[PDB]
Amino acid sequence: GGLTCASAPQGTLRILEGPQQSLSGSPLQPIPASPPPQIPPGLRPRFCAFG
Amino acid sequence: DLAPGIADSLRHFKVLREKRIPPWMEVVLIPMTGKPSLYPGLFLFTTPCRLVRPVQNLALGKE
């Protein structure tokens, strides 16, 4: 009436919960790159010679 | 063969602030080859004195 060893298991199942990968879009930056410093339009000379 | 996917899943949790993974856990996975490289294994640090720095996470754009 006691507990005895039974037949060895024939296989093992290991369960884990996993989600999946999306598409590669690689959206690097809101406003991207190093935007260049640049000329103010027209500007004009702010200096003249004497005479 | 589950270490890479686990590291990527844990990195996605910290970036999107899911689960309770601190926004600053370091999921490290030092791969193992046959070469005398650094000892292999998946570490996960969350202690209060490490240095961290921001980087734009591509493929998610989530800093």
PDB file of N, CA and C in Angstrom, chain A residues 4-38:
ATOM      1  N   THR A   4       5.739   3.354  -4.741  1.00  0.00           N
ATOM      2  CA  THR A   4       6.897   2.653  -5.361  1.00  0.00           C
ATOM      3  C   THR A   4       7.405   3.463  -6.558  1.00  0.00           C
ATOM      4  N   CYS A   5       8.674   3.296  -6.934  1.00  0.00           N
ATOM      5  CA  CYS A   5       9.180   3.997  -8.141  1.00  0.00           C
ATOM      6  C   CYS A   5       8.513   3.431  -9.399  1.00  0.00           C
ATOM      7  N   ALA A   6       8.078   4.298 -10.322  1.00  0.00           N
ATOM      8  CA  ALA A   6       7.326   3.829 -11.511  1.00  0.00           C
ATOM      9  C   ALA A   6       8.238   3.901 -12.733  1.00  0.00           C
ATOM     10  N   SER A   7       7.690   3.818 -13.956  1.00  0.00           N
ATOM     11  CA  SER A   7       8.631   3.777 -15.072  1.00  0.00           C
ATOM     12  C   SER A   7       9.246   5.149 -15.327  1.00  0.00           C
ATOM     13  N   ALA A   8      10.439   5.145 -15.741  1.00  0.00           N
ATOM     14  CA  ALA A   8      11.147   6.382 -16.062  1.00  0.00           C
ATOM     15  C   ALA A   8      10.405   7.177 -17.133  1.00  0.00           C
ATOM     16  N   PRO A   9      10.345   8.454 -16.939  1.00  0.00           N
ATOM     17  CA  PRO A   9       9.721   9.256 -17.995  1.00  0.00           C
ATOM     18  C   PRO A   9      10.402   9.085 -19.349  1.00  0.00           C
ATOM     19  N   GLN A  10       9.645   9.139 -20.427  1.00  0.00           N
ATOM     20  CA  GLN A  10      10.142   8.944 -21.784  1.00  0.00           C
ATOM     21  C   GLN A  10      10.545  10.271 -22.420  1.00  0.00           C
ATOM     22  N   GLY A  11      10.078  11.375 -21.830  1.00  0.00           N
ATOM     23  CA  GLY A  11      10.391  12.691 -22.362  1.00  0.00           C
ATOM     24  C   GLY A  11      10.156  13.812 -21.366  1.00  0.00           C
ATOM     25  N   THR A  12      10.712  14.960 -21.681  1.00  0.00           N
ATOM     26  CA  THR A  12      10.529  16.159 -20.868  1.00  0.00           C
ATOM     27  C   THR A  12      10.021  17.317 -21.721  1.00  0.00           C
ATOM     28  N   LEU A  13       9.073  18.051 -21.185  1.00  0.00           N
ATOM     29  CA  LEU A  13       8.597  19.291 -21.788  1.00  0.00           C
ATOM     30  C   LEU A  13       8.939  20.489 -20.906  1.00  0.00           C
ATOM     31  N   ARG A  14       9.611  21.491 -21.463  1.00  0.00           N
ATOM     32  CA  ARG A  14       9.904  22.735 -20.717  1.00  0.00           C
ATOM     33  C   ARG A  14       9.145  23.845 -21.417  1.00  0.00           C
ATOM     34  N   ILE A  15       8.267  24.522 -20.704  1.00  0.00           N
ATOM     35  CA  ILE A  15       7.425  25.613 -21.182  1.00  0.00           C
ATOM     36  C   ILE A  15       8.011  26.951 -20.736  1.00  0.00           C
ATOM     37  N   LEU A  16       7.972  27.921 -21.644  1.00  0.00           N
ATOM     38  CA  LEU A  16       8.366  29.301 -21.300  1.00  0.00           C
ATOM     39  C   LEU A  16       7.412  30.156 -22.146  1.00  0.00           C
ATOM     40  N   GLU A  17       7.166  31.418 -21.789  1.00  0.00           N
ATOM     41  CA  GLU A  17       6.264  32.315 -22.560  1.00  0.00           C
ATOM     42  C   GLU A  17       7.100  33.346 -23.322  1.00  0.00           C
ATOM     43  N   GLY A  18       7.008  33.381 -24.654  1.00  0.00           N
ATOM     44  CA  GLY A  18       7.859  34.305 -25.431  1.00  0.00           C
ATOM     45  C   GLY A  18       7.126  35.107 -26.497  1.00  0.00           C
ATOM     46  N   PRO A  19       7.342  36.438 -26.607  1.00  0.00           N
ATOM     47  CA  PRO A  19       6.765  37.255 -27.679  1.00  0.00           C
ATOM     48  C   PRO A  19       7.725  37.314 -28.875  1.00  0.00           C
ATOM     49  N   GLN A  20       7.351  37.950 -29.999  1.00  0.00           N
ATOM     50  CA  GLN A  20       8.148  37.918 -31.266  1.00  0.00           C
ATOM     51  C   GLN A  20       8.776  39.261 -31.670  1.00  0.00           C
ATOM     52  N   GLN A  21       9.652  39.275 -32.693  1.00  0.00           N
ATOM     53  CA  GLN A  21      10.340  40.440 -33.232  1.00  0.00           C
ATOM     54  C   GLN A  21       9.489  41.185 -34.260  1.00  0.00           C
ATOM     55  N   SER A  22       9.515  42.535 -34.243  1.00  0.00           N
ATOM     56  CA  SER A  22       8.869  43.306 -35.317  1.00  0.00           C
ATOM     57  C   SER A  22       9.792  43.582 -36.497  1.00  0.00           C
ATOM     58  N   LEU A  23       9.309  44.357 -37.463  1.00  0.00           N
ATOM     59  CA  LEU A  23      10.102  44.680 -38.657  1.00  0.00           C
ATOM     60  C   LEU A  23      11.253  45.601 -38.268  1.00  0.00           C
ATOM     61  N   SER A  24      12.414  45.520 -38.939  1.00  0.00           N
ATOM     62  CA  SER A  24      13.470  46.517 -38.708  1.00  0.00           C
ATOM     63  C   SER A  24      13.218  47.834 -39.429  1.00  0.00           C
ATOM     64  N   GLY A  25      12.910  48.890 -38.675  1.00  0.00           N
ATOM     65  CA  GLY A  25      12.718  50.217 -39.250  1.00  0.00           C
ATOM     66  C   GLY A  25      13.882  51.150 -38.937  1.00  0.00           C
ATOM     67  N   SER A  26      14.484  51.005 -37.759  1.00  0.00           N
ATOM     68  CA  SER A  26      15.691  51.731 -37.383  1.00  0.00           C
ATOM     69  C   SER A  26      15.517  53.241 -37.507  1.00  0.00           C
ATOM     70  N   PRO A  27      14.548  53.841 -36.745  1.00  0.00           N
ATOM     71  CA  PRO A  27      14.214  55.265 -36.839  1.00  0.00           C
ATOM     72  C   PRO A  27      15.178  55.923 -35.853  1.00  0.00           C
ATOM     73  N   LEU A  28      16.337  56.316 -36.356  1.00  0.00           N
ATOM     74  CA  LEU A  28      17.440  56.828 -35.511  1.00  0.00           C
ATOM     75  C   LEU A  28      17.157  58.107 -34.720  1.00  0.00           C
ATOM     76  N   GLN A  29      16.589  59.154 -35.323  1.00  0.00           N
ATOM     77  CA  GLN A  29      16.481  60.429 -34.555  1.00  0.00           C
ATOM     78  C   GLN A  29      15.223  61.234 -34.905  1.00  0.00           C
ATOM     79  N   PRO A  30      14.597  62.007 -33.966  1.00  0.00           N
ATOM     80  CA  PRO A  30      13.463  62.894 -34.307  1.00  0.00           C
ATOM     81  C   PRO A  30      13.943  63.835 -35.415  1.00  0.00           C
ATOM     82  N   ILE A  31      14.707  64.870 -35.057  1.00  0.00           N
ATOM     83  CA  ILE A  31      15.341  65.715 -36.112  1.00  0.00           C
ATOM     84  C   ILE A  31      16.743  65.114 -36.248  1.00  0.00           C
ATOM     85  N   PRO A  32      17.026  64.295 -37.284  1.00  0.00           N
ATOM     86  CA  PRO A  32      18.293  63.555 -37.380  1.00  0.00           C
ATOM     87  C   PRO A  32      19.565  64.203 -37.936  1.00  0.00           C
ATOM     88  N   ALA A  33      20.725  63.584 -37.670  1.00  0.00           N
ATOM     89  CA  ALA A  33      22.028  64.054 -38.207  1.00  0.00           C
ATOM     90  C   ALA A  33      22.499  65.279 -37.419  1.00  0.00           C
ATOM     91  N   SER A  34      23.662  65.838 -37.764  1.00  0.00           N
ATOM     92  CA  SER A  34      24.078  67.110 -37.120  1.00  0.00           C
ATOM     93  C   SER A  34      23.726  68.214 -38.118  1.00  0.00           C
ATOM     94  N   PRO A  35      22.592  68.940 -37.974  1.00  0.00           N
ATOM     95  CA  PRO A  35      22.195  69.920 -38.985  1.00  0.00           C
ATOM     96  C   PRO A  35      23.249  71.028 -39.053  1.00  0.00           C
ATOM     97  N   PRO A  36      23.696  71.413 -40.264  1.00  0.00           N
ATOM     98  CA  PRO A  36      24.768  72.398 -40.403  1.00  0.00           C
ATOM     99  C   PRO A  36      24.486  73.861 -40.046  1.00  0.00           C
ATOM    100  N   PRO A  37      25.475  74.580 -39.473  1.00  0.00           N
ATOM    101  CA  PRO A  37      25.333  76.017 -39.199  1.00  0.00           C
ATOM    102  C   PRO A  37      25.308  76.713 -40.564  1.00  0.00           C
ATOM    103  N   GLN A  38      24.588  77.834 -40.704  1.00  0.00           N
ATOM    104  CA  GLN A  38      24.468  78.397 -42.079  1.00  0.00           C
ATOM    105  C   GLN A  38      24.267  79.912 -42.183  1.00  0.00           C
TER     106      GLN A  38
END
